[PDB]
Each structure stands twice: as structure tokens, then as C-alpha cells.
Design a protein around this nucleic acid. Structure first.
Ligand SMILES: [Mn+2]
Ligand SMILES: [Mn+2]
Ligand SMILES: [Zn+2]
Ligand SMILES: [Zn+2]
Ligand SMILES: [Zn+2]
Ligand SMILES: [Zn+2]
Lengths: 543, 545
RNA sequence: UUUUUU
RNA sequence: UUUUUU
């Protein structure tokens, strides 16, 4: 009896670079193709994309692609991925496809078979797969969950989601809980669900509540208002455009990425500015209380607009006492220091600084425990793969499932590369495939690996000494320093002596070029450690 | 034109760390504390930060003595560095504070430091102009004091670092001296200096007695071994754990050099009293799992502390397993979030039960939240106010809190390190600045690593490096060495050579000084690699040759 | 919101 | 919990 294989290639045991492979027989369907953002220890790199060794091996079996939404951790890896694979059908909702199309054009990727769907549509992949799209609210529009119908039964994938009763834009957007409930009645064999906020009790706040909170705050602001949020948070931004209009403020969209997303959102009907956007020059004609800037830089990026404002380097705008700055965002793990740096600079300028939790001006795009419980109760799945989370999230999602009236028969904590076997009464990890990370640094893809990073870490912590050692005319050593210590004549003289004394034992004996280096390298390491207590990288050199 | 008190913060203002405050009246100085600070992520490779003491060196003959409020590292960690460069003067503090400093000075070989023990209520004199009176304030370490500094212009009340804990839980009757603080308000407080750490937190910081109750409830329910980490200096927390362990039939192992160190100091000064002797890891191995509790270093995610080694499977004598419970009785300090998260995920992957806030209320801050800060402001009714021990966000929010109360201070200032704050019966202003700032410690080096050195470290960390050396003879050729730049690639290597070489050759073809030529080849390669890779590696060009 | 140091 | 891009 053939089984379905669920093979996560990214997005399990991490938050980022989501990509999930489904295989039945010799047919494959792939879902998403995200990037991930670098951690602190991954110094100097720009982004991370998934290893696609498995898809390369089985590329002839790929029948199609599903794209759940246009967040970068779901579509950011596609330029890299699609370039190495056959041009298969790629299905997605309008805003998702618009963002992908633009991204593919930057990379000069030609003839990608993008195919528009909408909620309720059924899409056939080969003989064995049918996928049905349904609406789930999230922090970007045109976000979908799906039901993948297979020979062994149905998989429901929630997508990334929250259950927001009212996103505030008046477009009637709501999660299709009716469809999800019916799926539970029809029978869900496997649930795949968003674990991001599985450790958070209660219910994620509604965007309509955040908008009310923002209007109340902004209504009370005496002068200019500056607000930062994710450029892709179309609902948040639309609601701000409407409250601004009601509060007699004109809006400036500041930052390249803000203008970019505003363009795609408008083109696909999700953004409708009640009054036209103005430039900073144009709003300069207005009184302070008539002005609102919606700005990039919610995560503390120094070169984003908020960053330049906070550091006094913005070319056309200068913050001053009386200004209000609203951070309509929470720092993502790893960005705490950067955001804090901007916050303290803002206090020092003397602006009024508004942020959570002091002011309730942000709602997560992801379901908290009550919402995750709702989906588990409605679907009543036989089997469960908590997804889109680090192990702590997945495991807490699993624990939450056990608190409910009808828990799954079995729950697994998948890792990237796991082959998860699915059948009517089968649910197990049956093996593994090649999975992992590929680093992008500038233009280069995979030229930087973990070995290289290790080097960057050593340089950063201990600094560098370059030593040119010459036996001719008489043995002597010369020194260039980087990040080791400030200039010290005393110290500098002593290190040459150590290296030159070491060539002496080498020089008096017959010494090969190679043999000498290690000996004096040992001399300096022994010495420099003695003198400074530090272990700087040294690169020996002979002319 | 009347003589004024100068309050000159040299550290601890506009930051959390390296606290040190100078009081000057005429030709007399009293100094308070000598802390270190911990490096930020951009300060790569360095171990700790100590204050610039240029001011104290200039005026060393005027220094009458020192007040040490408590033994936390951000109040005493700089003293070895500071005391070594100054005259021996009287140094006052409570017993645990002095025990910790004494040991610190011993490690450094510093001799003949004049440590003088005080206790709550003691009044000590510094020269003609200063009298300091110590009083108890609860905090996350024992023997923590605030003080009233009585000067010719009036009284300064300094809260020290504090919370208002009604019961730290150790059965020793320890409580903040709010009676004394209220009396100070009636006598008249000219200037209040208060701890702003938690000024953005509404309500009241939880009590250690509640945390102890919560820990006992959790531990009573643990089926197997329990490992717990907290700050090694959280003597109240640890003592309460010792006592609940006894009630719950578990023996205790203190693990990690630092745990043993603070336990030694706490026991020697009577703050820690284990109801049963500590055991070693070998000794508890004789016991059933549910009889065992490990109190471990590593609460901030340090990979080489005990919890770190347990989490990574590298502990030489102990191995975690499914069924173990690990409790993080702490919250990550800003900047340590990633390190703690790393350990938490490894613990989950091992399969231990992992217990931490906010899911479980197993930690209480050592510092006052807004209700407690308001209580102090209301009791002292100060004329002038210096919010302290906080970054500007904390200080400014403390100032705003003061404005909401029934009797706000006449004036509140947000001081910066190096500020000269002038204080008189009706004067409160910043009148100038003095040299202030950071000195980095890296290994044995003090001040040999500076910001210029760090900037180089950043650039190296990000872009890696390319050292290009041009050799003129016999025929000019270029040599390339890369570290942390990219994995080996011969094609690119040879391309970099030619771009450099053309500049060398073209530069020789039209005459230029060797210094001019290196610049030309640095420029060409920077232009080439940026086009080729999109990166700007650190470039070290050499023409000698 | 203070260290940690097989 | 997703980018920013004087
Ligand atoms: Mn880079
Ligand atoms: Mn170091
Ligand atoms: Zn998303
Ligand atoms: Zn996502
Ligand atoms: Zn303290
Ligand atoms: Zn402190």
C-alpha cells in the first residue's frame, strides 16, 4: 500500500525558509519556497535559502507548486530555487503572485508559469493530488490555507494564520472557519499548523482593535506623527490611512520598501488611500498636526527611514521635541538591541515615543493558543505535524493538542529533511533526505559556508596580525595589525623579536620555508598570549 | 555665589552598568561604588568595561573615602582597576559586600585596601562636609543599602538598587527601611537619586516569597531529577530553594565555579544556611532521580557555564535525559535573548521538561516597578530628582512617573555620565562636564583595545579580508590571501590578481610613489569585487616588494 | 539588568 | 517572526 510522503525541506524546527514537499508515487507537489534571515553568529551574510538536493534529484516528478502567501519566509527563496528546476505550474493568490513576479524579474527569470487562483478553487496536480484553497487571516492579504486531497486521505494545512474576526479594512475578510469545520467532519487525516505563538496564552488581538488604539493615540498628538510598521502589513497601513484622513492628516509613505508594497497592494485592490499620498516636501507646507509619515525600519535597521531619523542623518526630515514616533511593531527575536538603540536615540531627541506593551499598537499575524485550539478542535485530525516554529514552539503546540477533548492519535515533531510517512493508520518518520541551509552573501550563493563563518567569528573576537618574515639578507620579521590592539611600540618590537628568534633556531639549522612558519607561529602565539592574554589570528608570510 | 555640592556621575547614568558617582563639596570628595559593565554585541571580543577615572586621578588628594552599596558586579566589578590607580582611602560597606570585594582584590593581588564594615543605621563621616547614613533596601543580593548623604547644602537620599519586597522568604526578618525613608521625607530630602531600571513596568515587582511558593509547587510535582539555574548571587532565591528542597526530600548539588563562590561568601556572612550539607554530583548519583536537585550556573545562556554544557551534551560528569526537569529561574537580560533561546531549544530537543517565565512565574526582578518607585517618591517628597541606573528611556519614564504624583519634584534632570550636577538649597542644574566614558578590558589588556580596534573587528566579522601584496620583481605579479571571505575558488582568485596587476603595471607605466600605487590597486580591486561579488571585503594592500 | 570561567 | 536597502 503506497503511502504519502511529507518531506519538509525548510521551516520545521525554525522560523523561516518554509518549503514542504508532498510525494505520492512518482508525483510531487511543493509548497512555498521561503528565505530565512541570518542570526547573529552568521555574520556578514544577507539571507539563507533551502538546500534543494532532493528536488534536483526528483525534478522530473514535480507536478506543481503552491504559494500560500507573499511573506519573504515563504517566497524569498524562489528566485534561487526556480532557476535550477523545470518550469512547473505555480499557483497562488493575486498579491502573492504580484510580489513573486516582481522578484523574478529582478533576477531576470523568464517564463515562470505563474497561475492565479482564489479561495475555493480546486487545483489538480497529476493523478494523485487535488488542492483546495481557503481563506485564513494573517498579517498580509491574499493568505491561504489549503486542503490537499490524496489517495490516503486529506491533509489540511492552516498556512501561517491568526483568527482575526475583523481586520478593520471593511473588505469583509475573514478566515473560512466554516470550510475548516466541514473538513473536520469530512475527515482530516493530517493537520499541519502554525506554531509561531504556541507558547502565548489567550487570543491574538484584532487589527480592528489596534486601529482603534492607534486612532485614539494619534487623535491626541499635538504635532507631527511618525509611525513605523512592516511595509507588508497592508491591513495595518490601510487602517492608518483611514484614521489619518478622519483625523485631518495627510500621509507620506517613506522608505523604498514601503512604496514597493503600497504599489503591489494597490494594484491588487488591497490598498485604497482615501487621499493621495504626499511627499515630505509637500507636507512641509502643512501645520505639524496635519502630518503623518508611515516609515520603514520597524526592526531597527539603521539605514531604514526610522533609523536615519533617530540618528539625525535623514536628508530631508529632522525629528524634534513635540514629534510623536509610534513603533507599530514588536522586535523580532535577535533585533532587540537594534530597536532599543533607536528607542533610546528617540528619547534623547525628545520626541514622544509610543510602543508596546505600554501602548497596544501591535497585533501579531499569528494565532495564539486559543486560536490554535480552535483549529485543532474543528479539524479533529488523526495525525498532527506542528509546523512553522522552533522545537520549543512545535513541542508546546503538541502539548496544547493534548489538553483538548479529542487529541490526535499521534503527533510528530518533524525536522527538515525528515521523510514523514502518511497512511490511513500510519504516521512515522521513515527516513531522511538531504536538507539544510545555503548562504547568500552579496551576489554569491553558497560561496560562504560554515567554515568561512568560523573564520569571521575568530577575526571578530581576536583580531589579526600579518607577519612577513624574511631570511634575506639576515633573518627578520615585519608586522601589519588589524583589530588586535592599539599601536604599541613596546609590544610591536617584542613580537618581531619572538618571530626573529624563532627563525634563528630555524636559520642556524637548515630550514625549509614551510617548517619555519609553524615554529615562529608557535613563538608568537606563546608570546602574544603571554603579553596580552589574547589569541589573535596570525597569517605568516615569506617573500 | 554660595558653595555648591557637585554630583558627578562617572558611570551608571544613561546606561545600566559600571555605576560610580562622585560627590564633591569644596576640596572634599566621596565616591559611591565602582562597577563594571558588560559588553554589547558590537563590542566584539572584549571581556568587560570599566569607567574612565580621569576625574578621580586629577583630584585624587581630595578623595575622603568610598561607599559600597552592594556586591553586584555593576557596582563593585571595577574596583580592582580603580583602586590600583588611586590612594588608599577608607572603603565602607556591609559584610557580604566587603567579603566579595575582599576576594576580588585578593585575586588581583591588591594589598592594604582599607575595607571598613558597616551595618544598617551606621553613620560614617568623610572629612568636614559629609556624613553618610546607611539603611536597608531589599534587592536581589543581601546586604544591600541605600544611604542618606548629609551635606552643607542639605540631604541627598540615594535609594541604591532596590525593590520593595515585603518578604524575601528566608525567615530572617529582612525588609526595606521605609520608616527611615519616610522620616527622611519629613526631615527634608533636597535631592533624590533613584533606581530607574524597571520604570517602564506598571504595578509592583513580585515577592521572592511568591516565587519560592511557585518553585515548591513545581518541584513537588517533578517526577525525576530537577536542574535549576539562577544568578549565583541570588542568595535569597537559592536559600529558599535549599529549604523547599529539604521539605521535598531532595538533596542539593551546587554546580559551577560561580555558584560555589557566592555560596561560600553567603555562608561566611550568615546569609546562606543549608538545612542539609551540599552533595557532589557523584554523591547524588547514589540517590533516586526524584531525590536530586542541581542548582547550576548559566542562567544567561553562557555556553561554558553548567547549564550550557548540559544543554549541548558536553558536561563531563552529568548527562541530561528525558524525564529531567530544567528550571530557568531568571529572565534573559537584554542582549542575551538569543543565547538563552539557543539553550532552551536544545533542552527541548533532549526531551527534558523546560520551565521558565512567563509560562511559569519562577523569577522576580531585583528592581522596583512603578508602584514601588512611586512609593519612594511619595515618601521622600524631594525638592530635586535624579533618575539613575537606567538608559535614557528608563530615566525619562521615571521622571514622567514623578510628574503624575501628588507632589512632583520642583525640577528633575536627566543626567549623563560626566555631567556636573550643581546642587544647592534652591539650585539644581548641569553646570559643565568632566571627562567620562568607557575603558575596555580584553584579556590582560586594559585600555589597549579601543573603538578604532573594535571597528576593525566589525569590518572583519562582516566582510572577511583580502590581503593583496604586489611583488615587483623579477616581473610584477600580485599575491592574494583571503580569510573568512569565501571558500576556495581559483577562477576568482586569478581575476582579482589581474585587476590588481594592471593597476600595478599601469601605475608603474606613469610614475608614482609606491604609496600611490598600492592605493590604485586597492581601488581597482574594490571596484572589481563589488561588481563581481557585491561584497566589500576588508582590503590590505602591500607593494613591498 | 548581572556574569560566567572543563 | 519579517526584511531593509543614503
Ligand atoms: Mn556580506
Ligand atoms: Mn577577548
Ligand atoms: Zn506569513
Ligand atoms: Zn511564515
Ligand atoms: Zn544590584
Ligand atoms: Zn546595579
Amino acid at each position: 500500500a503506497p503511502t504519502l510522503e511529507v518531506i519538509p525541506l525548510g521551516g520545521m524546527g525554525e522560523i523561516g525558509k518554509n518549503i514542504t514537499v508532498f510525494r505520492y508515487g512518482d508525483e510531487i507537489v511543493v509548497v512555498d519556497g521561503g528565505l530565512a534571515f541570518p542570526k547573529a553568529h552568521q555574520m556578514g551574510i544577507d539571507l539563507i535559502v533551502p538546500r534543494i538536493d532532493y528536488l534536483l534529484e526528483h525534478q522530473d516528478k514535480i507536478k506543481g507548486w503552491i504559494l500560500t502567501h507573499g511573506h519573504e519566509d515563504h517566497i524569498g527563496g524562489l528566485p534561487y530555487i526556480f532557476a535550477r528546476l523545470p518550469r512547473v505550474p505555480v499557483y497562488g493568490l493575486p498579491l502573492t503572485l504580484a510580489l513573486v513576479r516582481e522578484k523574478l524579474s529582478e533576477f531576470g527569470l523568464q517564463d515562470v508559469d505563474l497561475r492565479e487562483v482564489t479561495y475555493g478553487d480546486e487545483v489538480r496536480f497529476g493523478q494523485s493530488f487535488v488542492a483546495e484553497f481557503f481563506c485564513m487571516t494573517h498579517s498580509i492579504p491574499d493568505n491561504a490555507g489549503y486542503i490537499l486531497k490524496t489517495p490516503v486521505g486529506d491533509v489540511l494545512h492552516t498556512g501561517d494564520f491568526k483568527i482575526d474576526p475583523d481586520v478593520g479594512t471593511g473588505a469583509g475578510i475573514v478566515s473560512d472557519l466554516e470550510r475548516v469545520e466541514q473538513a473536520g467532519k469530512d475527515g482530516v487525516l493530517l493537520l499541519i499548523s502554525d506554531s509561531t505563538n504556541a507558547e502565548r496564552p489567550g487570543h491574538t488581538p484584532s487589527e480592528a482593535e489596534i486601529a482603534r488604539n492607534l486612532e485614539e493615540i494619534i487623535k491626541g498628538c499635538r504635532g507631527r506623527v511618525f509611525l513605523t510598521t512592516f511595509a507588508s502589513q497592508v491591513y495595518r497601513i490601510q487602517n492608518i490611512l483611514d484614521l489619518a484622513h478622519r483625523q485631518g492628516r495627510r500621509v507620506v509613505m517613506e522608505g523604498r520598501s514601503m512604496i514597493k508594497y503600497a504599489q503591489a497592494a494597490q494594484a491588487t485592490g488591497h490598498m485604497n488611500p482615501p487621499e493621495p499620498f504626499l511627499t515630505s516636501e509637500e507636507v512641509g507646507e502643512l501645520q505639524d498636526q496635519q502630518v503623518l509619515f508611515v516609515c520603514t525600519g520597524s526592526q531597527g535597521q539603521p539605514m531604514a527611514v526610522l533609523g536615519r531619523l533617530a540618528f539625525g542623518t535623514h536628508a530631508k526630515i529632522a525629528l524634534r521635541r513635540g514629534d510623536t514616533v509610534i513603533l507599530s511593531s514588536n522586535p523580532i527575536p535577535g533585533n532587540e538591541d537594534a530597536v532599543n538603540l533607536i528607542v533610546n536615540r528617540l528619547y534623547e531627541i525628545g520626541v514622544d515615543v509610543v510602543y508596546p506593551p505600554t501602548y497596544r499598537v501591535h497585533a501579531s499575524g499569528h494565532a495564539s493558543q486559543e486560536e490554535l485550539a480552535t483549529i485543532l478542535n474543528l479539524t479533529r485530525p488523526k495525525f498532527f505535524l506542528p509546523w512553522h516554529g522552533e522545537p520549543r514552539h512545535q513541542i508546546n503546540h503538541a502539548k496544547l493538542a493534548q489538553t483538548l477533548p479529542r487529541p490526535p492519535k499521534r503527533t510528530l515533531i518533524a525536522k527538515n529533511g525528515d521523510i514523514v510517512n502518511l497512511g490511513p493508520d500510519e504516521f512515522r518518520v521513515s527516513g531522511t533526505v538531504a536538507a539544510g541551509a545555503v548562504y547568500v552573501d552579496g551576489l554569491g550563493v553558497g560561496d560562504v559556508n560554515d567554515d568561512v563563518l568560523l573564520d569571521r567569528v575568530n577575526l571578530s573576537q581576536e583580531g589579526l596580525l600579518i607577519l612577513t618574515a624574511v631570511l634575506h639578507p639576515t633573518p627578520h620579521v615585519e608586522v601589519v595589525a588589524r583589530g588586535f590592539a592599539r599601536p604599541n611600540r613596546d609590544l610591536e618590537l617584542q613580537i618581531r623579536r619572538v618571530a626573529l628568534e624563532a627563525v634563528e633556531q630555524g636559520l642556524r639549522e637548515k630550514k625549509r620555508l614551510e617548517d619555519v612558519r609553524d615554529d615562529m607561529y608557535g613563538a608568537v602565539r606563546r608570546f602574544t598570549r603571554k603579553a596580552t592574554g589574547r589569541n589573535p589570528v596570525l597569517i605568516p608570510m615569506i617573500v
